[PDB]
Every structure is written in structure tokens, then in C-alpha cells.
Write a protein that holds these residues in place. Structure first.
Motif, mmCIF file in Angstrom:
data_model
loop_
_atom_site.group_PDB
_atom_site.id
_atom_site.type_symbol
_atom_site.label_atom_id
_atom_site.label_comp_id
_atom_site.label_asym_id
_atom_site.label_seq_id
_atom_site.Cartn_x
_atom_site.Cartn_y
_atom_site.Cartn_z
ATOM 1 N N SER A 149 0.838 -1.184 0.000
ATOM 2 C CA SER A 149 0.000 0.000 0.000
ATOM 3 C C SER A 149 0.886 1.253 0.000
ATOM 4 N N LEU A 150 0.615 2.182 -0.922
ATOM 5 C CA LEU A 150 1.435 3.391 -1.083
ATOM 6 C C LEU A 150 1.306 4.300 0.133
ATOM 7 N N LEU A 151 2.431 4.556 0.796
ATOM 8 C CA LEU A 151 2.469 5.423 1.968
ATOM 9 C C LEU A 151 2.900 6.826 1.564
ATOM 10 N N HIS A 152 4.038 6.936 0.883
ATOM 11 C CA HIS A 152 4.568 8.220 0.427
ATOM 12 C C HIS A 152 5.166 8.108 -0.973
ATOM 13 N N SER A 153 4.911 9.125 -1.791
ATOM 14 C CA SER A 153 5.449 9.226 -3.132
ATOM 15 C C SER A 153 6.408 10.403 -3.192
ATOM 16 N N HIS A 154 7.698 10.108 -3.306
ATOM 17 C CA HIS A 154 8.745 11.122 -3.378
ATOM 18 C C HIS A 154 9.124 11.392 -4.840
ATOM 19 N N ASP A 155 8.832 12.604 -5.324
ATOM 20 C CA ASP A 155 9.099 12.979 -6.721
ATOM 21 C C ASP A 155 10.573 13.330 -6.917
ATOM 22 N N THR A 156 11.177 12.828 -7.999
ATOM 23 C CA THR A 156 12.572 13.140 -8.355
ATOM 24 C C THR A 156 12.674 14.012 -9.619
ATOM 25 N N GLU A 157 11.627 14.801 -9.872
ATOM 26 C CA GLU A 157 11.574 15.762 -10.975
ATOM 27 C C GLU A 157 11.703 15.036 -12.324
ATOM 28 N N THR A 158 12.753 15.344 -13.092
ATOM 29 C CA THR A 158 13.021 14.718 -14.391
ATOM 30 C C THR A 158 14.033 13.575 -14.302
ATOM 31 N N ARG A 159 14.510 13.277 -13.093
ATOM 32 C CA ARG A 159 15.611 12.329 -12.891
ATOM 33 C C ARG A 159 15.113 10.936 -12.490
ATOM 34 N N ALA A 160 15.339 9.955 -13.359
ATOM 35 C CA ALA A 160 14.970 8.573 -13.065
ATOM 36 C C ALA A 160 15.967 7.952 -12.085
ATOM 37 N N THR A 161 15.442 7.459 -10.962
ATOM 38 C CA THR A 161 16.250 6.730 -9.991
ATOM 39 C C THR A 161 16.515 5.323 -10.536
ATOM 40 N N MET A 162 17.791 5.029 -10.788
ATOM 41 C CA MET A 162 18.209 3.780 -11.432
ATOM 42 C C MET A 162 18.752 2.741 -10.468
ATOM 43 N N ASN A 163 19.203 3.170 -9.289
ATOM 44 C CA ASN A 163 19.716 2.257 -8.271
ATOM 45 C C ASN A 163 19.583 2.831 -6.880
ATOM 46 N N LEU A 164 19.589 1.933 -5.895
ATOM 47 C CA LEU A 164 19.368 2.277 -4.489
ATOM 48 C C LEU A 164 20.315 1.533 -3.579
ATOM 49 N N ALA A 165 20.655 2.163 -2.464
ATOM 50 C CA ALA A 165 21.288 1.474 -1.348
ATOM 51 C C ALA A 165 20.690 2.038 -0.082
ATOM 52 N N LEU A 166 20.639 1.211 0.955
ATOM 53 C CA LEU A 166 19.966 1.557 2.201
ATOM 54 C C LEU A 166 20.919 1.399 3.385
ATOM 55 N N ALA A 167 20.862 2.354 4.309
ATOM 56 C CA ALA A 167 21.714 2.351 5.501
ATOM 57 C C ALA A 167 20.982 3.047 6.636
ATOM 58 N N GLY A 168 20.414 2.246 7.534
ATOM 59 C CA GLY A 168 19.601 2.758 8.626
ATOM 60 C C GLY A 168 18.399 3.512 8.084
ATOM 61 N N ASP A 169 18.383 4.818 8.338
ATOM 62 C CA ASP A 169 17.318 5.713 7.888
ATOM 63 C C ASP A 169 17.729 6.536 6.668
ATOM 64 N N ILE A 170 18.873 6.192 6.074
ATOM 65 C CA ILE A 170 19.413 6.902 4.922
ATOM 66 C C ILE A 170 19.314 6.032 3.679
ATOM 67 N N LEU A 171 18.856 6.662 2.607
ATOM 68 C CA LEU A 171 18.699 6.022 1.329
ATOM 69 C C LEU A 171 19.575 6.767 0.346
ATOM 70 N N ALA A 172 20.422 6.031 -0.372
ATOM 71 C CA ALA A 172 21.236 6.579 -1.455
ATOM 72 C C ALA A 172 20.607 6.175 -2.778
ATOM 73 N N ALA A 173 20.400 7.140 -3.670
ATOM 74 C CA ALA A 173 19.660 6.927 -4.916
ATOM 75 C C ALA A 173 20.431 7.454 -6.114
ATOM 76 N N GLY A 174 20.799 6.564 -7.030
ATOM 77 C CA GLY A 174 21.435 6.975 -8.277
ATOM 78 C C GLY A 174 20.420 7.603 -9.207
ATOM 79 N N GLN A 175 20.690 8.831 -9.645
ATOM 80 C CA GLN A 175 19.806 9.563 -10.553
ATOM 81 C C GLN A 175 20.640 10.228 -11.626
ATOM 82 N N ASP A 176 20.396 9.885 -12.889
ATOM 83 C CA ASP A 176 21.292 10.252 -13.984
ATOM 84 C C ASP A 176 22.745 9.928 -13.559
ATOM 85 N N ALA A 177 23.661 10.900 -13.599
ATOM 86 C CA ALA A 177 25.055 10.695 -13.199
ATOM 87 C C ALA A 177 25.346 11.142 -11.764
ATOM 88 N N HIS A 178 24.325 11.146 -10.904
ATOM 89 C CA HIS A 178 24.446 11.626 -9.522
ATOM 90 C C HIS A 178 23.974 10.592 -8.513
#
Length: 338
Positions: free
Chosen positions: A52-81
Motif C-alpha cells: 500500500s502506497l504510503l509516500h510518493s517522493h518525486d525526483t523531478e526529471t531524474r529517473a532513480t536507477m539504483n538504491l542502497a539503504l543504511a539505517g534511515d538513509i537512502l542513497a539513490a542513483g539519478q542520472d550521473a548523480h
């Protein structure tokens, strides 16, 4: 399906503590609303596991291609960032943006993989330019930068005792200590070999209750697609000594993703054709396979954690694998009890 997002999905994470399923992607054709983002889904057992969808976080024009998780921190690859986000519950969910940094610098740049070290003090990234970059968390102060491959980096993994494994399109799999090469893996090297193999994925796992427990799991795929493609292979390596312990053919469908359960007990695979498999990691035995579960490439898979809110959700079942794909869908895959 468990969930259908408004855009193609590229990456998956499951938080054990909050019990949240974090599905990320983009390139969605939609007039109003959202073309790219990260969706946080509450998993609740009902009558049968449900999302069930809780929250939708918009990334503007940048597609999130990869993720890593660490506690309460999320790292998200978007374009070259790489973008960092903090997330916390209360059911409301508060999601703060933190820093971002550019991690790839080719003429057509893209970050292809990201992960944390164990203590979540470091972040390692890899992309099209062949350079591994290592960043402090949460400051994203660059601490390392070096050429790991002559082509694009396909995957990487920070193991125990600091070791970094990287795999590229240059057919090499390299093991590093900081920026110093420790060794390479040499599996990949007949006269009439129709194609060389390239390493497509790499993951450390600690197989529990086993004295010889520390493993590195790799996947090898044909470098060139052929009329009759030869099989992909799943290989278990000694995690300390880097000897190939077991190599198992895992079909002619091209493997697109790998995941190891938090426990180290189970491996998950997805393929380009949308198929999904669960293996037992110690012996590389298939426990579960469904052909073309999705219509199109499986972009990531992720096990239900064995700790935290997970056990309650799992119930009598042995484990659960979630898969995501370019079809914008998240599927659940349950192993039988006992």
C-alpha cells in the motif's frame, strides 16, 4: 501483482526496522502527476501479504536507477548523480533531501551501482566512466577515486574486512583494498569459444551456521548475444581466498540482477525476459523458478528481511522475494513452509 507504480521500476529496497518496501524508477509517460520517483509502500498482512502506497517522493526529471539503504538513509542513483535521503515514520512518513554529488563523468554519464560499507560511514559508486569513487556519509566528501575498469562498471560490492569487488564490461572482475588491486578473478579465461563471458553481478554473503561461511557470489553472462546464446553461470567463491567453489549454469535467459538475503541463506535472480529464481546460496540449488513472471526485464530483486518487522509479515512461509521490472510492477514470490 503486489503493486503497480506510475512509472517503470529500476530498484528495490526493503527496510527491516520500518517494514517499508522502497521501489524506485522513472521514465513514465504521464500528462500530470509523476514521471520519476521513489515510492514507499507499507507492507501489511491482511486476511495474505499486501502492499500500500504510503509516500510518493518525486525526483523531478531524474529517473532513480539504483538504491542502497543504511539505517534511515537512502542513497539513490539519478542520472550521473547519487542523491541521499533521510526517511522516518510518524502513519505519516517524513522524507528529507540531503546532499547529492556527481559520481560519473563520461560523455554520456550514468551511475550504475551504489552501496554502503558495513558501518554506513562510506559510500561506493560506479558508472560508465570506469571509476570507483568512495564518499563519506552523510557529507559526500570524496575520499577515493580510481580507475577500476576500461569500460562501464556493471556492479560492485563492499565485503567484510574492507574488500571491494568490481565487475566491468572489460570482462574483468577485480578485488580491491582501498585503491590497491588485491587480485583478479580468472574464471573467464577453448579455442573455438563462440563468446567470452563477462561478470554481470557480484555480492558478498555470510552463510549462517557454516564454519566455511564467507562467500562472494558472481554471475557470468555471455558478452555477445548469440543466435543460440550459451548459458549464464552462477559462481560461489571463497570470500577470503577467492577460489571458485561452485559454478552452476542458471539458464540461457540473460541474468539481469542478483540479491543475497540479509541472512546469507538465499540468492535471488531476475532475467531480461522477466523470469525470477530463488537459489540456496550454500549449494547453488534452485528452490523456485517462474519463467516470465514479468513481461520484460527484471531490474532488481530483494528478499523480505529476516529481522525487524519482516518475520511478522512472512508468517509460515520460509522466505519472500520481491521483484521489480520495467513493466512498473512489483511481484511477491513466496517459498513454501518447511
Amino acid at each position: 501483482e503486489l503493486y503497480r507504480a506510475p512509472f517503470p521500476l529500476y530498484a528495490l529496497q526493503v527496510d527491516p526496522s520500518t517494514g517499508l518496501l522502497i521501489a524506485a524508477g522513472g521514465g513514465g509517460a504521464a500528462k500530470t502527476g509523476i514521471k520519476n520517483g521513489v515510492h514507499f509502500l507499507q507492507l501489511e498482512l491482511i486476511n495474505r501479504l499486501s502492499a500500500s502506497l504510503l509516500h510518493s517522493h518525486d525526483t523531478e526529471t531524474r529517473a532513480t536507477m539504483n538504491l542502497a539503504l543504511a539505517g534511515d538513509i537512502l542513497a539513490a542513483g539519478q542520472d550521473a548523480h547519487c542523491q541521499l535521503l533521510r526517511f522516518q515514520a510518524h502513519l505519516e512518513l517524513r522524507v528529507e533531501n540531503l546532499q547529492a554529488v556527481q559520481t560519473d563523468f563520461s560523455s554520456d554519464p550514468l551511475q550504475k551501482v551504489v552501496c554502503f560499507n558495513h558501518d554506513n560511514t562510506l559510500l561506493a559508486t560506479g558508472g560508465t566512466d570506469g571509476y570507483v569513487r568512495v564518499w563519506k556519509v552523510p557529507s559526500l566528501e570524496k575520499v577515493l577515486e580510481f580507475k577500476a575498469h576500461e569500460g562501464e562498471i556493471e556492479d560492485l560490492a563492499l565485503g567484510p574486512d574492507g574488500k571491494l569487488v568490481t565487475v566491468g564490461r572489460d570482462l574483468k572482475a577485480s578485488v580491491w583494498q582501498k585503491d590497491q588491486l588485491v587480485t583478479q578473478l580468472h574464471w573467464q579465461e577453448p579455442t573455438f569459444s563462440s563468446t567470452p563471458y563477462r561478470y554481470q553481478a557480484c555480492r558478498f554473503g555470510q552463510v549462517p551456521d557454516q564454519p566455511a561461511g564467507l562467500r562472494l557470489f558472481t554471475v557470468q553472462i555471455p558478452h555477445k548475444r548469440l543466435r543460440q546464446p550459451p548459458p549464464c553461470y552462477l559462481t560461489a567463491w571463497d570470500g577470503s581466498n577467492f577460489l571458485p567453489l561452485r559454478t552452476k549454469s542458471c539458464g540461457h535467459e540473460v541474468v539481469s540482477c542478483l540479491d543475497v538475503s540479509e541472512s546469507g541463506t538465499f540468492l535471488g535472480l531476475g532475467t531480461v525476459t522477466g523470469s525470477v529464481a530463488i537459489y540456496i546460496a550454500f549449494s547453488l540449488q534452485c528452490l523456485y523458478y517462474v519463467r516470465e513472471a514479468h513481461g520484460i526485464v527484471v531490474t532488481d530483486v530483494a528478499f523480505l528481511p529476516e529481522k525487524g518487522r519482516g518475520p511478522e509479515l512472512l508468517g509460515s512461509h520460509e522466505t519472500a522475494l520481491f521483484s521489480v521490472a520495467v513493466d512498473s510492477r512489483c511481484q511477491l514470490h513466496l517459498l513454501p513452509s518447511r
